Amino acid sequence: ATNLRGVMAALLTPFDQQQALDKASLRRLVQFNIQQGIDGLYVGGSTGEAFVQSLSEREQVLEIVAEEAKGKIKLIAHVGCVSTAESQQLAASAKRYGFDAVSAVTPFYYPFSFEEHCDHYRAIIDSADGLPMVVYNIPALSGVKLTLDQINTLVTLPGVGALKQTSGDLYQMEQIRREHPDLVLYNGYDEIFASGLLAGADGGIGSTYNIMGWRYQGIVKALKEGDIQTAQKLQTECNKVIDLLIKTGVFRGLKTVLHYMDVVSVPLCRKPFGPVDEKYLPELKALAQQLMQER
Amino acid sequence: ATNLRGVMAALLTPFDQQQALDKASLRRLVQFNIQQGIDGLYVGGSTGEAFVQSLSEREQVLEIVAEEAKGKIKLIAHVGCVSTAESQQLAASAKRYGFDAVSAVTPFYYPFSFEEHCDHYRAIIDSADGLPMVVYNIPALSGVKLTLDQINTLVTLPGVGALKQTSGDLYQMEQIRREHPDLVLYNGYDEIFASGLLAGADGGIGSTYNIMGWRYQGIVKALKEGDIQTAQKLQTECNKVIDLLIKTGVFRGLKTVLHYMDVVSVPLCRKPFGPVDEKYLPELKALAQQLMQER
Amino acid sequence: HHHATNLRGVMAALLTPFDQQQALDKASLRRLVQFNIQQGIDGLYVGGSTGEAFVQSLSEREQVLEIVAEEAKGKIKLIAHVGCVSTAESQQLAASAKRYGFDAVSAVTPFYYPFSFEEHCDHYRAIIDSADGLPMVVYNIPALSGVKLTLDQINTLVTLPGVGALKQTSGDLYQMEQIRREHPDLVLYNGYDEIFASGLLAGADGGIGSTYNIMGWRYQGIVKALKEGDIQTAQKLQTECNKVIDLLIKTGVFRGLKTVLHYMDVVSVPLCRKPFGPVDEKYLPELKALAQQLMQE
Amino acid sequence: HHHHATNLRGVMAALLTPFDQQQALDKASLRRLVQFNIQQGIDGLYVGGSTGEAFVQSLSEREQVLEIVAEEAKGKIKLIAHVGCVSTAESQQLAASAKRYGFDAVSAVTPFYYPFSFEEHCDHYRAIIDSADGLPMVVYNIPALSGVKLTLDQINTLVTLPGVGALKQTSGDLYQMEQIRREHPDLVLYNGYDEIFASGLLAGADGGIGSTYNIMGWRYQGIVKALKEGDIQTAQKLQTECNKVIDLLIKTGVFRGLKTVLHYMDVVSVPLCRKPFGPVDEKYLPELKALAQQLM
Ligand code: NA
């Protein structure tokens, strides 16, 4: 599964003022990511606003991304739903469109037993019909509190090739790297990318890579050579942005900056996400101009 | 509003062997409840397994239920989704089918601001076109922790006729009853129903009312007449069952009881809910045969 | 648990008075104890959370226990909160409580460091020993202690030989019923004053609380009202308690209580120990007005 | 005040407190430990903190430990006195004592159990700083045990109080570690969870303080070096080795695990912690003994 190792932008999903899918802007953002030199895309994840789309909408997005990008970079399809049957549909669709991998968040809202969780992944793994699975652990949003042992069982299920570990627990990262020396182990929290790598992540999947994905590859390069100053300097500039994005709202801030880069046309998230407070437009515009110059 | 006061069953959704909608068993369950003397039904809530269904399936359930109970008991439509747009679609359908009110859980998974929560409700109230809204607060599952002030604002929004309070905080129950003397206030945890009423709830919405809803009406009567011992005795019997349901899985325990009551053909929940452990079958059959003796 | 049946009722969690130098105010301690008695309280729970146990030395806690016993022994029931993180310290205070002739002892589940359930269980066995015959009251307050006990763990705790009661400062009234159902005769103190009527209805047969220092009769009233099947009076009385508790939460509960007792000529100096700060001056009118209200009543 | 305290930047053991079979202070085993620590090349000792079992000692006992440590270590290594109690007045007594005995710095955990306002926390620190009489203050943040959840802003106000020169940051949140370094470029920032030291340093900690340093503090000193050199590889091997040992120490119980290890290195005569802590489980002695030998 080492072919899946790298820095993958958690792709955003553009909408218009009607809240419909903006497929023109999706295609453009997909190409924008290819020309920044991204290693791959993680499609319809949290950052993709999965949980405010229908299965049909999620399918249309997968199909377009595979058209624009298949064979150009690696493609992981986030197919997770609370329902197993829905997650299976999305898996089957991912395979149809020629994706390289599937991924599913631990199903949320209702408490499920670990056995139920395991059967959920086995079931999706089947429907993906040979596509490797990227287990997605995001305790802060899912409310699902997996133990290291339980993580070990999931990552060794037949058909699992990777872990998207959106956890700030860098003790646990090491423990995972230690127990699974080959594992494609994505750091999920952008704001700690450099440190997660040191603990043992060998790439990442992140929302902010859509506007500065080079800085994160810049960090992967910086560390490989042992240039720690450049690594830290880059994470700081990344974190200056992450502070901003947190004030503004992260997905809608990211989409706003992409509006000013003429890549996205209507920087709206879907309701009940509201719009970016106008008071921030100046900083976002200016951040857009700043980043275009750097690329 | 005040015509929404009462003990309402959180209607389960029966599925057949292929995990599609069992229309037959749904209809029987609706009538089973009507017979038990329940005051109303709350349809396509957490208990109805709404979050593992498609909008169309939710619309179809609301239709079948309204066909069989409209005019005979009160009918509340839980239309809530993460997406506002999806919630507004279900509300508009609840209107068409002739439901007496609609309800929405606070939108979950993504962090939303309180003001975004407010707009969400306003938007769904609009689309509901005269049906009053029942705010549904379930912090243990939603992750949305409302302060008393935020609740006060939500429950005074134009068109809000009640609050379904699935919280064990009976200070906050009392505080809401004190601040809003006329508010329909449903106790949401079955296992504290008697105390919830004592704290200021004047009714309740619950999943266990499906198999023993006369017991909850009995607790109401007894408090109304000063039979505190009788109230406590009934709550104890309710909790003896809830103890079992928690060990078996509440929804699938309930359906299984109901299968042994000749109401549910196949007592299955949707994956990733697993089946009921076979070791609990002797206990659950006993419990339904005992409940059939009772009324 | 029939052995501790006589421990049943409504006990004030006694506040510990201090002066402007943060030393114990022993004259105001005696006044506060006599006030609780002239009030009609069933008993006092001495040196607990409300009594600022955790910002006092063992010597200070002992000094306060001795004085309460002097003032109150044989007149009302006396429960000594002897709990510390350390078992040895808890044991010292246990022995002291016994020297002063207390009716019971009590200990919070030891906090800060994580301890195993087995480490907890022993802790209570070692204090029950030193209590030298005084019944024990397990004190469960997960919101402050960070100790998260299962129902099964609690069941074991509350059936250790020597245990005669549970002070349950938890708002989980499912669990309250479960503990009562399992223990028909267990003395079960409701700990969160703001849900007292609800707690009794769920299984509680009494309670220990901080606000009983200023309005204990109302809690006795809820108890009486529920026993004779008068829901409307219990609700009314609980609402009245809750309006005051709203205020106390805005002011700080301990220092607000002390301030009310100060306007009532009971407590010379209404200060808690640092790092508690003073009451915000903007709240003094409300607090004075409540003192007059409650004295009138 | 950050510029003034830069001498406190380094790696420093959180000292355990040996106890005899009667649970009283084992003064002999205590003196050895200061030596056993000093010979590892430790940059300092954080005395009477969590790992020093501060919260099951009396004030006199804590003062006695601080005194007997200052005898041995004053002049040789840095000496931080953790003087924190729930009570401000008690914390002030220990602060005064730490200054009499000639400690380099004091420290206090955010006061716990009772909910205190942020203004209350600030006044608490000010008061102890007054009593410290010129000794720099090391604010000690441990949300997992203390239950005190300060926002970034609150931390910023806290660490810029007059007299504050450092922060012991027992938190696994390495975004906040970076952010704090970014707000305070000259603040001494001690990584608090040993299991992420290497990662903490990368995020901005310019040193640390820890409990496992007692039995293997040379391993943590090796990491600082590798990162300054720009040698990422060895920094990971060492950090991996620390976590192999942390894994077992969590299984047995960390303080008593460590003390049982030291009992096998003949540093500590009776490897007990105070009740309610219990003895190590018997089944674990083979591995602990084995680990003591491996480390010697
Ligand atoms: Na049937």
Numbering used by the authors:
A (entry chain C), B (entry chain B): 2 to 296
C (entry chain D): -1 to 295
D (entry chain A): -2 to 293
Q: What does the original paper state about this entry?
A:
We therefore identified new conditions for the crystallization of E. coli NAL (in space group P21) that avoided the use of sulfate ions and allowed us to solve the structures of both the wild type and the E192N variant in the presence and in the absence of a number of ligands. The structures of complexes with pyruvate were also obtained (to 1.65 Å resolution for the wild-type enzyme and to 1.8 Å resolution for E192N). As expected, pyruvate was covalently linked to Lys165, and the planarity of electron density is consistent with the formation of the natural pyruvate enamine intermediate. The interactions made by pyruvate in that structure and in the P21 structures of the wild-type–pyruvate and E192N–pyruvate complexes reported here are identical. Comparison with the apo-NAL structures indicates that there are no significant changes in the active site upon pyruvate binding; the only difference in the two structures appears to be a further disordering of the C-terminal residues in a remote location from the catalytic pocket.
